[PDB]
């Protein structure tokens, strides 16, 4: 018993979709139902820098202003995306990320937003003492992911959403065969 019948059905369907290898369907259902957060999927999307999918998937579970954990999760991801654009010497893209994704954080700390904006004019953002130890894209995404996992695991909104239930294989298929 997984609480409601809708919740139990979602878990049975997730198993069915995984056995049929409908991989994109599995993650749309996790996202739209918001019943299960797939850490393995999230880690892979982050590792690959698929930022639009990372945020669309997270949006099925939380919004930037839900609590301090949700706020830091979107902040760390958007900061990484901005530093990557500066690292590729792509200043038009970095300004677009700053204005579209990071501006919301100026409502919490205006001085921090000004400091992040000022990185645009440095020849290398590593000249900022807070960022001097930033390695490369690979090392930075791995370090950010270690922090994101801690924030998600401590986030009360992800309670009961991090453990997939123990089910016998093809549970939905067995139950339907029993129904008639």
């Amino acid at each position: 018993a997984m609480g409601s019948l809708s919740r139990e059905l979602v878990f049975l369907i997730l198993q069915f979709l995984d056995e049929e290898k409908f991989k994109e369907t599995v993650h749309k259902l996790e996202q739209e139902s918001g019943f299960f957060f797939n850490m393995k999927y999230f880690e892979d999307e982050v590792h690959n820098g698929n930022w639009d999918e990372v945020e669309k998937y997270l949006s099925g579970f939380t919004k930037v202003d839900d609590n301090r954990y949700s706020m830091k999760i979107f902040f760390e991801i958007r900061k990484q995306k901005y530093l990557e654009a500066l690292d590729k010497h792509d200043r038009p893209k970095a300004v677009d990320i700053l204005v579209k994704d990071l501006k919301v954080f100026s409502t919490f700390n205006e001085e921090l937003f000004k400091e992040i904006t000022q990185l645009l004019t440095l020849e290398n953002f590593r000249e900022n003492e807070q960022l001097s130890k930033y390695g490369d894209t690979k090392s930075a995404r791995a370090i950010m992911l270690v922090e994101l996992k801690k924030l998600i695991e401590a986030n009360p909104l992800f309670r009961d959403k991090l453990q997939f239930p123990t089910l016998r294989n093809s549970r939905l298929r067995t139950l339907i065969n029993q129904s008639l």
Partner: peptide, 10 residues
């Protein structure tokens, strides 16, 4: 609570 410029996990 504070947001920081520094690398995640300090």
């Amino acid at each position: 609570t504070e947001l920081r410029l520094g690398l995640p996990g300090s």
